Amino acid sequence: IHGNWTIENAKERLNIYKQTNNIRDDYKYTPVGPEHARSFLAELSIYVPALNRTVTARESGSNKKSASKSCALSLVRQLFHLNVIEPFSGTLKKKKDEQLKPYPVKLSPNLINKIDEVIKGLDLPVVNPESSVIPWAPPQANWNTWHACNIDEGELATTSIDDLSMDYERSLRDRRQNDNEYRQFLEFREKLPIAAMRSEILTAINDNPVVIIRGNTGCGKTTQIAQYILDDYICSGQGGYANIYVTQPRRISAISVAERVARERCEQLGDTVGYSVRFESVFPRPYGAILFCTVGVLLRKLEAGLRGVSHIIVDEIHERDVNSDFLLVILRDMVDTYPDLHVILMSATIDTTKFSKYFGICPVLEVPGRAFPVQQFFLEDIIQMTDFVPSAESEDKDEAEINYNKVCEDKYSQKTRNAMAMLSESDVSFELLEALLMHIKSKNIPGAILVFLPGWNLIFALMKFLQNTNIFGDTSQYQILPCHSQIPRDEQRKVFEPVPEGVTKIILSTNIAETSITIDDIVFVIDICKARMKLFTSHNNLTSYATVWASKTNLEQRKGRAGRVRPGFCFTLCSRARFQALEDNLTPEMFRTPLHEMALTIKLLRLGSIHHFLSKALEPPPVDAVIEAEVLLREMRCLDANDELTPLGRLLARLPIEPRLGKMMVLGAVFGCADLMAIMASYSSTFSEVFSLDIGQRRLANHQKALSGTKCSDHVAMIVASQMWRREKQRGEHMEARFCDWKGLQMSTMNVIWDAKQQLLDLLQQAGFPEECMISHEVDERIDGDDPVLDVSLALLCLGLYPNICVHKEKRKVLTTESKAALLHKTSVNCSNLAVTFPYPFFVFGEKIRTRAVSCKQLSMVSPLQVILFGSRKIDLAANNIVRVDNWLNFDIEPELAAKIGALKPALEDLITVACDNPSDILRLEEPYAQLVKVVKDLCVKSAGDFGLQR
RNA sequence: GUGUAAAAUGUUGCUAGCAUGCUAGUAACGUUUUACGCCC
Ligand SMILES: Nc1ncnc2c1ncn2[C@@H]1O[C@H](COP(=O)(O)OP(=O)(O)O)[C@@H](O)[C@H]1O
Ligand code: ALF
Numbered sequence: 001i002h003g004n005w006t007i008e009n010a011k012e013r014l015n016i017y018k019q020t021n022n023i024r025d026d027y028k029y030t031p032v033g034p035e036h037a038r039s040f041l042a043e044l045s046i047y048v049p050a051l052n053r054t055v056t057a058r059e060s061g062s063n064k065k066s067a068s069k070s071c072a073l074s075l076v077r078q079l080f081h082l083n084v085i086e087p088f089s090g091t092l093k094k095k096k097d098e099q100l101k102p103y104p105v106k107l108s109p110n111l112i113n114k115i116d117e118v119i120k121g122l123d124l125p126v127v128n129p130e131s132s133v134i135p136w137a138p139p140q141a142n143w144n145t146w147h148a149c150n151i152d153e154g155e156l157a158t159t160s161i162d163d164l165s166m167d168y169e170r171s172l173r174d175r176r177q178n179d180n181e182y183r184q185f186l187e188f189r190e191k192l193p194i195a196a197m198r199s200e201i202l203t204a205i206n207d208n209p210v211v212i213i214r215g216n217t218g219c220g221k222t223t224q225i226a227q228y229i230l231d232d233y234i235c236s237g238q239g240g241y242a243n244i245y246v247t248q249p250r251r252i253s254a255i256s257v258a259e260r261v262a263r264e265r266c267e268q269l270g271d272t273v274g275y276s277v278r279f280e281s282v283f284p285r286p287y288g289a290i291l292f293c294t295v296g297v298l299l300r301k302l303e304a305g306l307r308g309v310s311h312i313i314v315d316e317i318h319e320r321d322v323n324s325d326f327l328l329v330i331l332r333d334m335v336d337t338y339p340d341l342h343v344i345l346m347s348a349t350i351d352t353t354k355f356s357k358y359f360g361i362c363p364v365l366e367v368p369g370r371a372f373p374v375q376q377f378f379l380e381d382i383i384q385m386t387d388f389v390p391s392a393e394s395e396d397k398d399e400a401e402i403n404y405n406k407v408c409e410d411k412y413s414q415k416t417r418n419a420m421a422m423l424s425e426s427d428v429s430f431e432l433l434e435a436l437l438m439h440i441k442s443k444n445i446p447g448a449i450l451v452f453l454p455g456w457n458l459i460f461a462l463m464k465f466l467q468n469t470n471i472f473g474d475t476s477q478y479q480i481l482p483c484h485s486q487i488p489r490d491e492q493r494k495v496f497e498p499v500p501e502g503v504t505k506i507i508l509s510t511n512i513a514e515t516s517i518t519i520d521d522i523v524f525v526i527d528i529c530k531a532r533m534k535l536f537t538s539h540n541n542l543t544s545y546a547t548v549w550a551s552k553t554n555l556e557q558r559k560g561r562a563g564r565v566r567p568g569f570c571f572t573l574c575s576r577a578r579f580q581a582l583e584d585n586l587t588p589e590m591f592r593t594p595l596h597e598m599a600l601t602i603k604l605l606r607l608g609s610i611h612h613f614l615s616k617a618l619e620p621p622p623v624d625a626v627i628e629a630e631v632l633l634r635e636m637r638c639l640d641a642n643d644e645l646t647p648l649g650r651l652l653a654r655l656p657i658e659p660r661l662g663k664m665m666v667l668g669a670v671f672g673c674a675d676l677m678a679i680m681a682s683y684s685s686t687f688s689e690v691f692s693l694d695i696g697q698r699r700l701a702n703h704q705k706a707l708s709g710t711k712c713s714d715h716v717a718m719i720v721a722s723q724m725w726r727r728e729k730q731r732g733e734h735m736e737a738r739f740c741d742w743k744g745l746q747m748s749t750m751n752v753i754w755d756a757k758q759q760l761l762d763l764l765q766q767a768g769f770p771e772e773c774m775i776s777h778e779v780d781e782r783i784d785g786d787d788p789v790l791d792v793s794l795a796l797l798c799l800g801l802y803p804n805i806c807v808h809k810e811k812r813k814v815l816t817t818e819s820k821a822a823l824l825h826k827t828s829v830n831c832s833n834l835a836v837t838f839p840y841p842f843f844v845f846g847e848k849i850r851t852r853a854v855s856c857k858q859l860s861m862v863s864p865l866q867v868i869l870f871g872s873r874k875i876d877l878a879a880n881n882i883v884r885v886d887n888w889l890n891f892d893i894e895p896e897l898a899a900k901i902g903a904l905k906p907a908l909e910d911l912i913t914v915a916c917d918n919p920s921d922i923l924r925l926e927e928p929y930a931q932l933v934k935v936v937k938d939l940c941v942k943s944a945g946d947f948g949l950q951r
Numbered sequence: 952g953u954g955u956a957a958a959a960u961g962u963u964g965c966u967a968g969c970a971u972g973c974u975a976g977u978a979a980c981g982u983u984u985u986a987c988g989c990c991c
């Protein structure tokens with residue numbers, strides 16, 4: 001009854017018990033009765049090695065299988081009677097894991113005495129359980145616009161701006177006279193649509209303060225309007241008294257548009273057109289030049305001043321990203337206060353009425369967009385055409401989910417015939433491409449093939465699948481090219497390269513190709529209205545790089561993205577039900593996003609209360625976002641609760657990194673490890689791959705794993721790689737490139753990290769911290785012992801990236817907070833196939849890749865002594881003398897020792913505050929603070945928490 | 952994006968026997984669940 005003592009249940013425990021006994025016997029069958037009333041008596045003997053009480057089953061049935069089942073019934077009943085078998089044994093039985101045992105403290109008495117002296121030498125008692133605007137000026141002599149300062153030397157110090165304007169004018173006249181490649185580029189730009197209303201757009205801008213351009217995508221407009229403004233300003237011989245400032249919302253888009261405008265101008269990058277993306281600047285000449293930058297770089301430059309720039313040409317606003325709307329909200333008042341500035345907002349296809357209404361009903365210009373509506377087809381249309389039904393043959397939820405695929409009427413074509421024949425919907429197959437090919441060959445429509453896959457992972461998977469199906473994946477006849485941010489610029493520049501007809505172009509891309517760039521020859525668009533949704537859930541610190549449906553506005557744009565003049569075809573892979581069911585627009589990301597970084601930015605520019613500023617924005621954000629920004633600023637001691645920016649906050653604002661790494665960079669110079677902190681912050685915030693993985697590789701190679709050395713950490717590997725790269729860069733790069741390739745170095749990532757380290761140390765120098773601590777602290781990896789610099793660097797790392805720590809159980813299988821299973825990313829140095837146990841069973845990662853908290857990246861072993869030092873914002877005490885870390889980690893330490901360790905929590909903040917207050921003398925601290933530095937260097941040593949008992 | 956053993960279904964052919972059928976299994980088949988152990 002209670003143990004469901006029947007045949008097809010409760011037998012799992014019996015099977016396991018017999019497996020433990022290894023008895024391979026079964027039921028012997030004996031016939032009883034005639035052939036018309038046949039019965040079988042089955043026998044089985046079971047030996048019990050634990051109770052020494054052998055049992056037997058002798059039961060009858062209508063057949064051999066029935067006899068065996070009847071015997072097993074009585075066997076389970078007798079095993080229960082024996083009180084040795086486990087009851088129930090249903091289909092519900094899992095196997096999980098938890099903490100086994102740490103090395104809780106077990107320190108030497110020296111460190112205990114040091115900690116006691118520190119807690120008594122610093123008196124840290126613990127209990128044992130207004131709206132102004134940024135000034136702007138017109139162009140001025142001896143003043144550089146880019147650097148926002150006075151050059152006071154060179155040529156402008158003695159040369160008037162009018163002379164520079166005349167020089168630019170004569171140079172452009174000579175270029176008009178002779179530059180033939182410029183002639184062909186300008187004729188291409190003239191046949192380009194915007195050159196229709198050249199003068200018109202050159203005048204409307206002077207007419208009004210706020211100017212909105214509106215014209216369908218693919219006009220080649222961003223790369224032309226700024227150049228036309230410069231040309232108009234220089235044709236009057238005034239190019240010196242004019243500069244152009246443009247902001248894109250994506251880094252790679254900014255790089256691409258800068259390269260395009262340089263190539264069309266037939267000029268080397270950095271002469272008259274330059275770009276300043278985060279951690280990279282190629283600033284051009286100070287006068288008569290164009291600047292492209294991301295919104296973040298402009299928000300950074302806003303601190304100094306917009307002096308010396310003529311017109312600002314803010315790019316795509318339909319993105320609705322937080323940065324662009326913040327910039328627009330500031331720029332509204334900026335251009336209202338100063339009537340001599342010209343703000344330009346650019347869109348692609350959006351009801352710009354709200355944008356115009358925001359700026360006091362500003363003019364909404366228009367571009368004549370030649371177009372031809374394209375044939376739009378859906379899943380019913382494609383099932384009518386060439387079959388569409390089959391496919392490749394918190395946990396859950398409620399009934400609120402509606403499957404529109406299964407809610408429809410079968411008034412369409414032979415749905416059952418298509419189902420019984422074939423199809424492949426979720427994964428594309430020969431069907432779609434062959435249908436397009438036959439449509440082209442029968443209706444005579446040679447044209448490019450365009451698809452919008454949501455993510456780079458799916459892009460790579462489908463590219464590999466189509467390469468496997470190379471009969472129709474034949475690049476010689478069916479050219480295939482991806483397009484995404486991650487891939488190098490070589491693929492982007494190859495995409496634009498045309499191919500002869502017959503070599504069909506099948507472009508695989510994502511939301512990037514919907515704007516920014518546009519291929520002229522696109523005819524047929526195969527949309528799936530799927531896009532990446534890399535959302536960070538800061539309310540619980542879970543990442544989700546999932547895929548979500550595109551908005552109806554975006555879907556309409558994609559429908560219009562193809563078919564310039566040719567008919568064009570839209571092969572939408574969705575039903576009309578979902579087509580009309582999804583939201584018309586896209587949810588404003590500004591509504592749901594933490595605003596701590598923007599709060600620090602607004603407090604840096606002394607723009608008054610954040611609440612009032614957010615009220616006077618495009619969309620009044622919900623009070624939760626401003627409240628959470630306030631909470632983060634108050635708890636992190638960047639901004640006081642009384643809207644008073646402490647020097648810590650002002651220092652953090654200038655840092656081009658998130659505050660969670662600025663808090664580490666502050667302490668980096670405190671403990672004489674600033675180089676390590678700069679390198680780690682650059683390698684962490686700038687999400688990048690450490691090593692150049694070769695094709696067909698599933699793990700890290702021999703040297704790729706040996707570079708981490710005895711430390712066996714990817715962060716230590718990166719540090720030593722940077723050290724060897726810089727000592728090699730001390731020599732020539734001709735052999736350095738092949739050496740880095742041999743060492744599996746990413747080269748470009750290393751350059752980025754080095755430049756970021758240089759910029760961070762320059763910023764720290766400007767802050768006031770001494771140069772002496774900013775010296776090389778070279779760490780070797782072959783040493784398996786201890787090194788104070790490296791262990792304090794790792795302790796600071798664990799301080800910063802909280803709560804991205806994890807507990808290792810076995811192989812890839814690791815545990816994360818709230819007891820979540822996870823694996824180790826392939827790029828990590830801790831990837832292998834054999835079972836290895838690490839010296840310390842605690843790891844901290846950088847990123848949580850893949851939505852279902854599975855992939856962890858940037859793993860590095862951490863000392864078991866973090867506990868309360870650098871492991872959390874909260875520590876607790878559990879039963880049976882257990883210290884609780886992040887409510888998912890257990891240590892076994894005396895409450896007195898736990899309180900002693902936890903008393904350091906206010907001390908860290910006090911040290912940070914003192915370091916920020918007096919940057920000039922961080923090396924020469926107060927004597928209790930020198931003792932604190934000494935004790936923290938002593939405590940975080942790798943082989944420290946093992947005294948008394950190594951176990 | 953996987954294999955092993957166990958159990959319910961029906962199936963392929965065969966087997967010992969009974970007044971064309973029948974009483975039982977056999978080797979194999981796929982389905983569904985169970986755990987065992989991989990790789991992302
Ligand atoms: N790398 C390039 N080489 C040549 N022409 C380009 C390049 N990139 C863009 N163009 C042209 O410039 C135009 C750019 O349009 P775009 O910047 O997307 O305008 P908007 O952003 O207003 O839609 C396109 O029509 C395209 O033909
Ligand atoms: F210039 Al755009 F989207 F129109 F980047």
